[PDB]
Design a protein around this motif. Structure first.
Motif, PDB file in Angstrom:
ATOM      1  N   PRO A  39       0.785  -1.241   0.000  1.00  0.00           N
ATOM      2  CA  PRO A  39       0.000   0.000   0.000  1.00  0.00           C
ATOM      3  C   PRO A  39       0.813   1.286   0.000  1.00  0.00           C
ATOM      4  O   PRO A  39       0.218   2.365   0.110  1.00  0.00           O
ATOM      5  CB  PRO A  39      -0.795  -0.122   1.303  1.00  0.00           C
ATOM      6  N   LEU A  40       2.133   1.230  -0.214  1.00  0.00           N
ATOM      7  CA  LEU A  40       2.928   2.455  -0.316  1.00  0.00           C
ATOM      8  C   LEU A  40       2.611   3.280  -1.562  1.00  0.00           C
ATOM      9  O   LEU A  40       3.195   4.359  -1.720  1.00  0.00           O
ATOM     10  CB  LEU A  40       4.424   2.147  -0.290  1.00  0.00           C
ATOM     11  N   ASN A  88      11.020  19.049   6.347  1.00  0.00           N
ATOM     12  CA  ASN A  88      10.840  18.077   7.425  1.00  0.00           C
ATOM     13  C   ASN A  88      10.132  16.827   6.921  1.00  0.00           C
ATOM     14  O   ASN A  88      10.517  15.702   7.253  1.00  0.00           O
ATOM     15  CB  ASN A  88      10.034  18.717   8.561  1.00  0.00           C
ATOM     16  N   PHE A  89       9.119  17.011   6.085  1.00  0.00           N
ATOM     17  CA  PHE A  89       8.334  15.897   5.596  1.00  0.00           C
ATOM     18  C   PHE A  89       9.094  15.077   4.575  1.00  0.00           C
ATOM     19  O   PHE A  89       8.768  13.906   4.367  1.00  0.00           O
ATOM     20  CB  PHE A  89       7.036  16.413   5.007  1.00  0.00           C
ATOM     21  N   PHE A 117       1.395   8.373  -3.869  1.00  0.00           N
ATOM     22  CA  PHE A 117       0.378   9.370  -4.129  1.00  0.00           C
ATOM     23  C   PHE A 117       0.713  10.674  -3.434  1.00  0.00           C
ATOM     24  O   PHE A 117       0.620  11.745  -4.042  1.00  0.00           O
ATOM     25  CB  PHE A 117      -0.972   8.849  -3.674  1.00  0.00           C
ATOM     26  N   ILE A 140       1.885   6.634  -0.272  1.00  0.00           N
ATOM     27  CA  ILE A 140       2.957   7.614  -0.125  1.00  0.00           C
ATOM     28  C   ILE A 140       3.461   8.020  -1.490  1.00  0.00           C
ATOM     29  O   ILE A 140       3.836   9.181  -1.684  1.00  0.00           O
ATOM     30  CB  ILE A 140       4.106   7.169   0.814  1.00  0.00           C
ATOM     31  N   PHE A 177       1.337  24.017   2.839  1.00  0.00           N
ATOM     32  CA  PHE A 177       2.194  23.166   3.641  1.00  0.00           C
ATOM     33  C   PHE A 177       3.621  23.705   3.740  1.00  0.00           C
ATOM     34  O   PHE A 177       4.580  23.028   3.368  1.00  0.00           O
ATOM     35  CB  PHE A 177       2.166  21.749   3.091  1.00  0.00           C
TER      36      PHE A 177
HETATM   37  C1  3PE Z   1       3.261  -3.780   7.912  1.00  0.00           C
HETATM   38  C2  3PE Z   1       2.948  -4.759   6.784  1.00  0.00           C
HETATM   39  C3  3PE Z   1       3.144  -4.068   5.438  1.00  0.00           C
HETATM   40  C4  3PE Z   1       4.618  -3.741   5.224  1.00  0.00           C
HETATM   41  C5  3PE Z   1       4.730  -2.742   4.077  1.00  0.00           C
HETATM   42  C6  3PE Z   1       4.429  -1.346   4.617  1.00  0.00           C
HETATM   43  C7  3PE Z   1       3.820  -0.456   3.532  1.00  0.00           C
HETATM   44  C8  3PE Z   1       2.891   0.554   4.202  1.00  0.00           C
HETATM   45  C9  3PE Z   1       2.474   1.648   3.224  1.00  0.00           C
HETATM   46  C10 3PE Z   1       3.282   2.923   3.449  1.00  0.00           C
HETATM   47  C11 3PE Z   1       3.123   3.373   4.899  1.00  0.00           C
HETATM   48  C12 3PE Z   1       2.394   4.711   4.963  1.00  0.00           C
HETATM   49  C13 3PE Z   1       3.273   5.736   5.674  1.00  0.00           C
HETATM   50  C14 3PE Z   1       2.594   7.104   5.620  1.00  0.00           C
HETATM   51  C15 3PE Z   1       3.627   8.194   5.886  1.00  0.00           C
HETATM   52  C16 3PE Z   1       2.953   9.434   6.457  1.00  0.00           C
HETATM   53  C17 3PE Z   1       3.652   9.775   7.766  1.00  0.00           C
HETATM   54  C18 3PE Z   1       3.293  11.188   8.209  1.00  0.00           C
HETATM   55  O1  3PE Z   1       2.621  11.869   7.510  1.00  0.00           O
HETATM   56  O2  3PE Z   1       3.764  11.667   9.438  1.00  0.00           O
HETATM   57  C19 3PE Z   1       3.045  12.750   9.946  1.00  0.00           C
HETATM   58  C20 3PE Z   1       3.889  14.029   9.940  1.00  0.00           C
HETATM   59  C21 3PE Z   1       3.428  14.975  11.054  1.00  0.00           C
HETATM   60  O3  3PE Z   1       4.315  16.051  11.184  1.00  0.00           O
HETATM   61  P1  3PE Z   1       5.204  16.220  12.565  1.00  0.00           P
HETATM   62  O4  3PE Z   1       4.619  17.284  13.448  1.00  0.00           O
HETATM   63  O5  3PE Z   1       6.632  16.568  12.205  1.00  0.00           O
HETATM   64  O6  3PE Z   1       5.139  14.869  13.488  1.00  0.00           O
HETATM   65  C22 3PE Z   1       5.698  14.910  14.770  1.00  0.00           C
HETATM   66  C23 3PE Z   1       4.580  14.966  15.808  1.00  0.00           C
HETATM   67  N1  3PE Z   1       5.147  14.830  17.136  1.00  0.00           N
HETATM   68  O7  3PE Z   1       3.891  14.617   8.656  1.00  0.00           O
HETATM   69  C24 3PE Z   1       2.898  15.529   8.268  1.00  0.00           C
HETATM   70  O8  3PE Z   1       3.089  16.693   8.384  1.00  0.00           O
HETATM   71  C25 3PE Z   1       1.586  15.063   7.634  1.00  0.00           C
HETATM   72  C26 3PE Z   1       1.478  15.555   6.194  1.00  0.00           C
HETATM   73  C27 3PE Z   1       0.757  14.503   5.357  1.00  0.00           C
HETATM   74  C28 3PE Z   1       0.115  15.176   4.148  1.00  0.00           C
HETATM   75  C29 3PE Z   1      -0.951  14.265   3.540  1.00  0.00           C
HETATM   76  C30 3PE Z   1      -1.975  15.102   2.771  1.00  0.00           C
HETATM   77  C31 3PE Z   1      -3.239  14.307   2.433  1.00  0.00           C
HETATM   78  C32 3PE Z   1      -2.927  12.939   1.830  1.00  0.00           C
HETATM   79  C33 3PE Z   1      -4.206  12.108   1.791  1.00  0.00           C
HETATM   80  C34 3PE Z   1      -4.488  11.601   0.379  1.00  0.00           C
HETATM   81  C35 3PE Z   1      -4.291  10.089   0.315  1.00  0.00           C
HETATM   82  C36 3PE Z   1      -5.641   9.381   0.263  1.00  0.00           C
HETATM   83  C37 3PE Z   1      -5.811   8.698  -1.093  1.00  0.00           C
HETATM   84  C38 3PE Z   1      -5.084   7.352  -1.124  1.00  0.00           C
HETATM   85  C39 3PE Z   1      -5.747   6.366  -0.161  1.00  0.00           C
HETATM   86  C40 3PE Z   1      -6.117   5.076  -0.891  1.00  0.00           C
HETATM   87  C41 3PE Z   1      -6.792   4.115   0.086  1.00  0.00           C
END
Ligand code: 3PE
Ligand code: CDL
Ligand code: 3PE
Lengths: 117, 86, 80, 183, 340, 59, 452, 158, 59, 60, 110, 70
Positions: free
Chosen positions: E184-185, E310-311, E190, E188, E303
């Motif tokens: 499901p990465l 950082n991100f 995406f 990320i 953002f």
């Molecule tokens: C285990 C078995 C399997 C083994 C294989 C593993 C594969 C797993 C798949 C990949 C794993 C997913 C990892 C996701 C990474 C995201 C991590 C993240 O965003 O961290 C949050 C961080 C928060 O910021 P910060 O303040 O610095 O955190 C410290 C707080 N004390 O950062 C941030 O600031 C957050 C910013 C995020 C921005 C996102 C914006 C919206 C995105 C949503 C659209 C996606 C939805 C569509 C797709 C979904 C489909 C179902």
């Protein structure tokens, strides 16, 4: 076993750390080298205080102090590691002669018994 | 091997006669490292599979770190980031 | 319910790439004749498909219909 | 023989025409704008010579990273440029560069094969004249591979890969400990 | 020779007419998402707005005395040529078996998505304004920092492939629906995909009037429609590129078409139909993807550059290096490696 | 690949006759060109006596 | 066991409170224990100097290279003690510079060689400007970088022509190819002159010297010695051109005259920079040999210990000046240290014996460095180059004795009231005592290297 | 410019060969394998032992090993003509994905082992082989629309 | 560090010359070595072709 | 708020994975790689040999 | 020819075409009215961007031929990634901007 | 084409700009007509002056007006 007919040549005794593969050779191998050791297995222990002898090397780092604080643990790790290499530097040899040669007594028998590889 | 010697020589004597702009000298010294690969790659093509082209991928991976250290050292050709000076 | 207007641009964005795929399929079966298309089996069709071109077109199963070994090709090119 | 598709190889004229721009620019960075044109002409050369793989490597990593980094620097702390190749700055230029171009042409001649004469100096310039190489046919090439063999050699010569791991390590630790200026 | 130029005209008119109506599409779907209606007035139905807007904004063309025209008259044409269009040279699963591309697929797309970045940087280099080019260096810095973790993840998903030509990924992925069902990465990827082609929830260098009443340069005229079309075309290309490798083409109803085409046609009637449903599959896997772009346009705000770096260089990249400490590891453990 | 290696003698022999029949015929052509003045057309360039392939041909 | 040390203490410098004066004590004691428990490879070293090869491209020559890396470890232990007992976070790249230098002293083949010379050069480019709050180091580092880039592509162009004439790379495949196609000779002298960037052979002369004076003294000890031994130890390990075939002899003629004609210098750093240049030019003369390495292996140590010694002595002489120069560089003029014999004259005695070292008065060094050099020369027959080496030694001795004659004239007003500054004193005393007591065990080494 | 040279002659000292035909021999690849295998082995052995000395196994083995393959394709053009024909007809589509025609495989192999009594011995003892009935794999996409009725009828009649 | 070359075929008959120590016979490998060289650069091949095209030039 | 502190490791891994957890869950994958790569030599229990090949030139 | 060379040649001329439409019929009549600073995180990000690109260029042939190097290419690249990830654990400790002006010290009286 | 897209640039000075952003409100939407305003005087067509206009503003307003296509 464990791989193809490809070969990995390594006759390693140097300052860049290496090891050995599964098997195809006549030199020293991977897992047999940690075994077939002797009472020099505390040679790695002798270094285990030597990098922990940095406290004895502390002849006034700062002004009028001693006993460097608890990063000696880190030093202790290096005090292991180099000595481990020194134990791994005790390749007496793998089935040559003209040396100490306990291998013809403690590893000739293993190559005798394991007659299926 | 005309194609690599000519770009190498022109980068080289561009690095000689460069009485303007320190960075043009710096990128001429960069383009030396791709004037040499046009020699190396066509010698490998005229020969064989991977013997010299291994050295080619080495010199590419290392020419990256060349330009990286050259930039991050040219930043310190002065004071750092910016202050009063003269 | 569903947005009748908003899925009309998605309907034509669907239909344009749909016709664009169908046209590629048609133009490659018209390019190759009534067969599918080969992928790059590198170094190997240039033995194989080039040999087919040295004999025939399309494909054929026989013994041999060559003449002067069906004119054996030899590639030549300039020095670099 | 598709007349232009035989002289499509001789693109070296565009290489020397770009490199004569590369040392005499007007602005300091229109030069490094032309440098990526030099690199993409090099990529065109390598695709034409039979290795498009390293063409796409140069497009990925030179004008993808290092030329991007030249443009990245040349925005900030822009150095004081002398304006162009003025005649007073073309002073003492021809008087050594002509002799240097001749001596380096003799060096390219010294890359020739084995003749202890000046005959090898003329031999490499006529290397295309008496020869056009003859390709062959596939005698037992089982699996398809172009840069796969590069990784096979990178497994045989693994130690230089594990050492250029250290040079990339240096490439990241150096710019930390030369520009961050810890507190 | 005539068939391939009419091929290439059909494919160009598909992509151009596509990216034309895409902006109307996204504005409509934002509008329904913003509880209103989009362009509902233009001409004949309301599907036509961008197709009139293109003819509109040609006829403006200003130039600026702070900048050479020779760079900004070409730099939005640069990213129009290379970033938008010749990314489709790879024919990113031109959705049939066939393509308009010979071979050696994925790193060509890598090279051209890499090539767009100084098309952005030299664009922002213009006008010599001391408040502008720092914003340019900001934009390009975050742009390359998420280029890197597009790159270092679609080179690790092809570790289940090992073949670098374009199709072999796609014929490999039809057994598992390999793309997201094993990993499901995608998500990320995406969230990487909104950054390296910034049509984002980030909007970061589009500080539209935070600067001196202009964001990029305001190169309006034909360079504006060039930048606009190339941004949207980079969006549908990288969205296709998601639907290329880490989302799947060749939907499983064509795998089941063994139980359908053998019940429909007798024997190979000009291959009349299967390329069409295959195109239908890839198109519905592509527009449903970019519908989430049009979500994330209007769901989460900008953002904050320092947090953006950082991100990149603190969170996603070490998770990534873990994730290809295991995908070489786990297939080595469980059974074995892939051939090519 | 096993399939391919069972084809590998066959196809190579398909070329081998050709690289007999192309080679000596080229040498006969050059016998016509170099006759008159005595010359070492009928001589290996490689000092080892074993058959090689002609290359670098001018068209 | 250096890679494990590097990856350990790069993790150790991470999550450190920027104390950063203790980690060097750990690196010093770690290299000390590594030498003490890794000298046991000398028994398995040589029956008849049997080489041992890692994977075809790396070479372990157990008499030569196994002594060279021991010298590297030794002088590194000395440098690491010199930083102990003004610093930034840098010993990680000291150790990786060592890793590169040891690779080029073990490099059989040119891919490993080129990677490692460039790794080494990148280390030099970085160490030159760690002290970034300078105007000296800022200029010197960029100058060193640009010319190291030129000389780097000279390396790579030499070897690319070498690959162009022969599809191999190894000098193991050179194997006395006695038909000796002339471009092989010209390629090899080009590779020689390429590697000889560091010695600053008299047409490549001046550029190193401004860099040496524009680094801090705690740095210019380190890079007047590391590549000086490294690239030449490669160059003597493989004897590229048996003789010069007059190309290199001209380079050392104009060197050993035209760098000792650089007599009049008032800056200290320039002075012993020319010293370390010309004594490096010395050992180029037995690059012109074949089957001769004992003189070279002995002359490295029986030069470099004393080079290290004279730098450590003028380190100790900062305390006695009643003026200093810039924050990074204390003592640049000769005339700063005038009345030093009326200060602690035991170090004046040490400075005396280590400069009489460099001029080569017999019973400590010069009758064992220069004697082996001259017997290696006159074994071959280079009769003219002997007498020009003698002229080089005399004129070098003149500016050498300049230091002692300005060292011990008379002080204006300074005798004695102080606190102490010690516990690194045993390092300088060890180098000085090993300098002037090698005449005791000057025969044991003659047997030991005869058995290796 | 990869220009083509197309010279012509014929050389005396041996009897001429008979060539072979197109990419459909990929279907017949195993079929020449087990029968003509020692001929293949002796050919490549004689080639490898004469170090550099090629062009001397032409009269012995370069003729012989082609004679065997010509015999095999004549036998298969009389034995199972259309069973070969629809099978390579499948196999020229689907990129020669040799998985992509694994149901007409069983028809052709049953016909061969019926009449010309050969096999497909893929050497290696560990896994299962040619009958897999895939069940976690990449079977086909267009399942040979002229040939599904064939294997269906072979399940029906036989 | 020598991939599957188009000139590998002259290592062995050069290296089997240096299998025995006839590199200290100093001439027994010179036919082998210069045949390796003609595999590398095709020099006397090229001179032979220049000769025959000079003869072509005089007709 | 509290960062991680080493001296109680069972406590450290807790008040790492709970206050700055985003590098913890990365390095859990980083330890799930090679440690599980060493727990396979019984777990394959001699499962399979791949058995691929270039051209098999045979013996006399 | 004939495959995609048409695309990379047609496209520049289409770019010049849609450029050169409105260079003529747009009204111009141009009337009138038409050193620097820094940070470490504005520079070191792009400097450190480059090595982490070309280690992916290092990794790319290995991931091309993951096969033909079984049980051993895995080991070498695991060592490569260990040597790289320790560089990552170096750079995690430092790279962030620092807000210069925020003070909090307690206040004292006599 | 000119009548269809028709985007302004906001100049937006006072209360009348609150009604302007009420035209971007969903009740009387701009985008049902095509009005999609950019914040940039070169990319604009028409320049809605809303709000009162100070003596202090007016040179900035005319300078915005001049950098605007014909
Ligand atoms: C285990 C078995 C399997 C083994 C294989 C593993 C594969 C797993 C798949 C990949 C794993 C997913 C990892 C996701 C990474 C995201 C991590 C993240 O965003 O961290 C949050 C961080 C928060 O910021 P910060 O303040 O610095 O955190 C410290 C707080 N004390 O950062 C941030 O600031 C957050 C910013 C995020 C921005 C996102 C914006 C919206 C995105 C949503 C659209 C996606 C939805 C569509 C797709 C979904 C489909 C179902
Ligand atoms: C799985 C169970 C393992 C059991 C093993 C049993 C065997 C017994 C053996 C006994 C020896 C113990 C070994 C453990 C070493 C752990 C190091 C440590 O913890 O020191 C803490 C210490 C933390 O500093 P601190 O100031 O004391 O703590 C301050 C704060 O509280 C803040 O402190 P912090 O917690 O935030 O520290 C950060 C730390 C996180 O803290 C941890 O220690 C968690 C790690 C858990 C164990 C995972 C690593 C062990 C796995 C094997 C080694 C992999 C490397 O992150 C790391 O350092 C990652 C290390 C590298 C991993 C990649 O680190 C150091 O100061 C330096 C020590 C490093 C020396 C170790 C070097 C050995 C590395 C071998 C590499 C091999 C390379 C081969 C290359 C070959 C090329 C050919
Ligand atoms: C492989 C690459 C994947 C991750 C590696 C990337 C870096 C992780 C190392 C790290 O981040 O350590 C630093 C962090 C504390 O650093 P910090 O105090 O925040 O420094 C900032 C000061 N300005 O320290 C941390 O808290 C983060 C690291 C926590 C991970 C600790 C180990 C977890 C692994 C679980 C296995 C533990 C082994 C023992 C298991 C018990 C037996 C079953």
């Amino acid at each position: 076993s464990t791989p193809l007919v490809k070969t990995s040549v390594n006759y390693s005794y140097g300052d860049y750390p290496l090891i050995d593969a599964d098997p195809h050779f006549k030199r020293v191998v991977g897992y047999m080298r940690p075994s077939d050791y002797g009472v020099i297995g505390l040679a790695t222990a002798a270094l285990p205080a030597g990098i922990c002898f940095a406290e004895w090397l502390d002849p006034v780092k700062g002004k009028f102090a001693r006993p460097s604080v608890k990063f000696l643990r880190v030093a202790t790790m290096l005090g292991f590691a180099v000595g481990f290499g020194a134990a791994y530097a005790r390749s007496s040899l793998r089935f040559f002669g003209v040396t100490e040669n306990a291998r013809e007594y403690k590893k000739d028998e293993a190559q005798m018994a394991a007659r299926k590889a | 091997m005309f194609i690599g010697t000519i770009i190498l020589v022109l980068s080289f004597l561009g690095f000689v006669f460069n009485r303007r702009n320190i960075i043009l000298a710096f990128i001429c010294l960069e383009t030396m490292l791709l004037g040499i690969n046009l020699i190396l790659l066509r010698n490998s093509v005229l020969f064989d599979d991977i013997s010299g082209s291994l050295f080619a991928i080495v010199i590419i991976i290392l020419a990256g770190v060349e330009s990286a250290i050259g930039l991050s050292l040219l930043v310190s050709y002065y004071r750092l980031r910016g202050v009063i000076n003269s | 319910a569903i947005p009748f207007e908003a899925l009309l641009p998605y309907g034509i964005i669907f239909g344009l790439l749909t016709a664009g795929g169908g046209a590629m399929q048609v133009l490659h079966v018209y390019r190759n004749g009534g067969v599918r298309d080969r992928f790059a089996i590198d170094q190997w069709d240039s033995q194989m498909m080039e040999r087919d071109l040295r004999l025939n077109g399309g494909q054929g199963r026989k013994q041999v219909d060559q003449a002067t070994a069906p004119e054996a090709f030899k590639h030549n090119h300039v020095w670099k | 023989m598709y007349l232009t598709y035989y002289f499509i190889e001789i693109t070296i004229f565009l290489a020397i025409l770009c490199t004569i721009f590369i040392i005499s620019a007007k602005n300091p960075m229109v030069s490094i704008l032309y440098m990526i044109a030099l690199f993409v002409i090099a990529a065109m050369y390598l695709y034409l010579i039979g290795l498009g793989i390293f063409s796409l490597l140069y497009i990925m990593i030179y004008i993808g990273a290092i030329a991007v980094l030249f443009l990245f620097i040349i925005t900030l702390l822009d150095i004081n440029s002398t304006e162009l190749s003025v005649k007073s700055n073309i002073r003492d230029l021809p008087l050594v560069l002509i002799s240097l171009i001749v001596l380096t042409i003799s060096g390219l001649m010294i890359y020739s094969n084995d003749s202890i004469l000046i005959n090898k100096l003329l031999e490499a310039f006529g290397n295309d004249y008496n020869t056009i190489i003859t390709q062959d046919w596939f005698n037992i090439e089982n699996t398809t591979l172009l840069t796969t063999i590069g990784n096979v050699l990178l497994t045989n010569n693994a130690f230089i890969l594990l050492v250029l791991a250290i040079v990339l390590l240096l490439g990241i630790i150096g710019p930390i400990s030369i520009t961050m200026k810890h507190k | 020779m005539i068939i391939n130029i009419v091929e290439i005209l059909i494919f160009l008119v598909c992509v151009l007419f596509s990216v034309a109506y895409l902006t109307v599409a996204e504005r409509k779907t934002l509008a329904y998402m913003q509880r209103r209606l989009g362009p509902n007035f233009v001409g004949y139905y309301g599907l036509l707005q961008a197709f009139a807007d293109a003819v509109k904004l040609l006829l403006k063309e200003i130039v600026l005395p702070k900048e050479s025209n020779y760079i900004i008259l070409v730099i939005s044409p640069l990213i129009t040529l290379i970033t938008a269009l010749i990314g489709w040279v790879v024919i990113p699963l031109g959705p049939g078996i066939t393509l308009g591309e010979l071979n050696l697929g994925i790193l060509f797309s890598l090279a051209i998505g890499s090539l767009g970045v100084f098309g952005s940087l030299l664009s922002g280099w213009s006008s010599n304004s001391k408040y502008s080019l720092l914003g340019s260096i900001r934009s390009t810095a975050q742009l390359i920092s998420y280029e890197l973790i597009l790159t270092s993840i679609f080179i690790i998903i092809i570790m289940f492939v090992s073949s670098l030509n374009i199709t072999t990924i796609i014929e490999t992925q039809r057994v598992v629906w390999y793309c997201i069902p094993l990993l499901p990465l995608l998500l990320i990827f995406f969230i990487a995909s909104v950054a390296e082609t910034a049509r984002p929830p980030f909007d970061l260098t589009e500080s539209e009037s935070e600067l001196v009443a202009g964001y990029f340069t305001e190169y309006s005229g034909s360079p504006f429609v060039f930048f606009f079309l190339a941004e949207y075309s980079n969006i549908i290309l990288i969205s296709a590129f998601n639907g290329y490798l880490l989302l799947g083409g060749y939907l499983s109803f064509n795998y089941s078409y063994l139980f359908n085409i053998l019940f429909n046609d007798y024997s190979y009637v000009s291959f009349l139909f299967e390329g069409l449903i295959n195109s239908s599959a890839y198109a519905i896997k592509l527009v449903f993807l970019m519908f989430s772009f049009i979500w994330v346009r209007a769901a989460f705000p900008r953002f904050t550059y320092d947090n953006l770096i950082n991100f990149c260089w603190i969170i996603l990249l070490p998770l990534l290096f873990g994730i290809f400490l295991i995908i070489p590891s786990t297939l080595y453990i469980f059974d074995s490696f892939p051939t090519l | 690949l096993w399939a391919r290696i069972y084809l590998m003698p066959l196809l190579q022999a398909e070329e081998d006759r050709q690289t007999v029949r192309r080679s000596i015929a080229q040498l006969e052509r050059e016998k016509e060109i170099m006759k008159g003045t005595g010359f070492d057309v009928d001589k290996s360039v490689y000092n080892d006596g074993k058959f090689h392939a002609p290359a670098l041909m001018i068209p | 066991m250096l890679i494990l040390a590097i990856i350990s203490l790069i993790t150790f410098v991470s999550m450190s409170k920027l104390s950063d004066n203790r980690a060097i004590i750990r690196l010093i004691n770690i290299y000390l224990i590594l030498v003490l428990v890794l000298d046991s490879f000398l028994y398995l070293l040589f029956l008849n100097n049997q080489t041992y090869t890692v994977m075809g491209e790396l070479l372990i020559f157990n008499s030569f290279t196994f002594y060279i890396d021991m010298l590297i470890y030794f002088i590194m232990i000395v440098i690491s003690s010199l930083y102990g007992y003004p610093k930034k976070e840098l010993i990680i790249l000291f150790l990786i510079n060592i890793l590169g230098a040891l690779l080029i002293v073990h490099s059989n083949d040119f891919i490993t060689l080129f990677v490692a010379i460039e790794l080494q050069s990148y280390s030099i480019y970085l160490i030159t400007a760690i002290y970034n709050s300078s105007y000296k180091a800022s200029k010197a580092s960029m100058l060193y970088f640009f010319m190291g880039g030129i000389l780097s592509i000279l390396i790579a162009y030499s070897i690319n022509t070498y690959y162009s004439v022969l599809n191999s790379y190894t000098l193991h495949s050179l194997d006395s190819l006695i038909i000796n196609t002339l471009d092989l000779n010209l390629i090899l002298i080009a590779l020689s002159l390429g590697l000889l960037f560091k010695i600053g052979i008299a047409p490549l002369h001046k550029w190193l010297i401004s860099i040496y004076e524009n680094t801090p003294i705690l740095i210019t000890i380190y890079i007047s010695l590391i590549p000086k031994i490294s690239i030449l130890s490669y160059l003597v390990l493989s004897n590229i051109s048996i003789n010069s075939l007059v190309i290199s002899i001209l380079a050392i003629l104009t060197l050993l005259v035209g760098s000792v004609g650089g007599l009049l210098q008032i800056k200290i750093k320039r002075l012993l920079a020319f010293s370390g240049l010309t004594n490096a030019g010395y050992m180029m003369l037995l690059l012109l040999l074949n089957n001769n390495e004992f003189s070279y292996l002995y002359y490295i140590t029986q030069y470099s210990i004393s080079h290290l010694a004279i730098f450590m002595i003028i380190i100790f002489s900062i305390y006695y000046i009643n003026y200093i120069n810039n924050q990074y560089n204390p003592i640049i003029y000769v005339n700063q240290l005038k009345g030093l014999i009326h200060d602690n004259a035991y170090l004046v005695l040490s400075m005396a014996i280590v400069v009489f070292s460099f001029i080569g008065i017999p019973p400590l060094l010069g009758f064992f460095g220069k004697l082996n050099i001259l017997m290696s020369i006159l074994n071959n027959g280079y009769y003219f180059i002997s007498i020009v080496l003698i002229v080089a030694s005399l004129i070098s001795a003149l500016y050498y004795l300049y230091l002692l004659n300005v060292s011990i004239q008379d002080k204006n007003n300074i005798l004695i009231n102080s606190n102490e500054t010690v516990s690194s004193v045993l390092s300088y005393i060890l180098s000085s005592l090993i300098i002037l007591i090698t005449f005791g065990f000057i025969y044991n080494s003659l047997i030991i290297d005869i058995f290796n | 410019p990869f220009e083509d040279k197309a010279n012509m002659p014929d050389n005396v000292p041996d009897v001429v060969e008979v060539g072979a035909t197109s990419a459909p021999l990929l279907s017949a690849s195993y079929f020449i394998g087990a029968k003509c295998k020692p001929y293949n082995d002796d050919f490549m052995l004689c080639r490898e032992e004469s170090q550099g000395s090629g062009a001397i196994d032409c009269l012995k083995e370069g003729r012989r090993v082609t004679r065997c393959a010509v015999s095999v394709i004549e036998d298969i053009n009389k034995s199972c003509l259309d069973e070969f024909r629809l099978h390579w007809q499948c196999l020229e589509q689907n990129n020669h994905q040799l998985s992509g025609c694994r149901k007409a495989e069983a028809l052709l192999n049953k016909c061969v082992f019926t009449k010309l009594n050969l096999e497909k011995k893929i050497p290696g003892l560990r896994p299962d082989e040619e009958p897999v009935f895939l069940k976690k794999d990449p079977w086909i996409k267009p399942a040979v629309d002229d040939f599904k009725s064939v294997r269906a009828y072979a399940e029906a009649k036989k | 560090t020598g991939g599957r070359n188009r000139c590998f075929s002259e290592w062995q008959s050069f290296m089997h010359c240096t299998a025995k120590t006839d590199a200290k016979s100093r001439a027994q490998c010179l036919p082998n070595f210069e045949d390796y060289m003609e595999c590398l650069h095709h020099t006397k091949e090229k001179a032979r072709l220049r000769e025959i095209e000079s003869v072509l030039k005089q007709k | 708020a509290n960062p991680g502190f080493w001296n109680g490791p069972f406590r450290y891994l807790r008040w790492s994975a709970h206050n700055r957890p985003h590098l913890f869950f990365a390095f859990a994958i980083g330890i799930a790689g090679p440690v599980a790569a060493l727990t396979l030599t019984p777990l394959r229990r001699k499962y399979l040999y791949p058995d691929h090949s270039p051209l098999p030139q045979s013996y006399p | 020819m004939n495959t995609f060379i048409i695309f990379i040649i047609l496209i520049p001329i289409v770019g010049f075409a849609l450029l050169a439409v409105n260079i003529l019929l747009a009204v111009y009549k141009p009337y009138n009215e038409k050193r620097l600073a820094f940070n470490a995180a504005f520079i070191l990000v792009a400097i450190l961007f480059l090595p982490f690109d070309l280690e992916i260029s290092t990794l790319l042939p290995y991931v091309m031929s993951i096969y033909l190097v079984s049980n051993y290419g895995f080991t070498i690249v695991l060592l490569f990634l260990l040597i790289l990830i320790i560089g990552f654990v170096y750079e995690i400790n430092t790279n962030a901007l620092k807000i210069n002006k925020h003070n909090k010290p307690n206040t004292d009286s006599l | 084409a000119r009548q269809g897209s028709f985007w302004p640039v906001t100049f937006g000075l006072a209360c009348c700009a609150v009604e302007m952003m009420h035209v971007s409100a969903p009740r009387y939407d701009q985008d049902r007509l095509g009005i999609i305003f950019r914040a940039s005087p070169r990319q604009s067509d028409i320049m809605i002056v809303a709000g009162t206009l100070t003596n202090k503003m007016a040179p900035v307003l005319r300078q915005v007006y001049d950098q605007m296509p014909e």
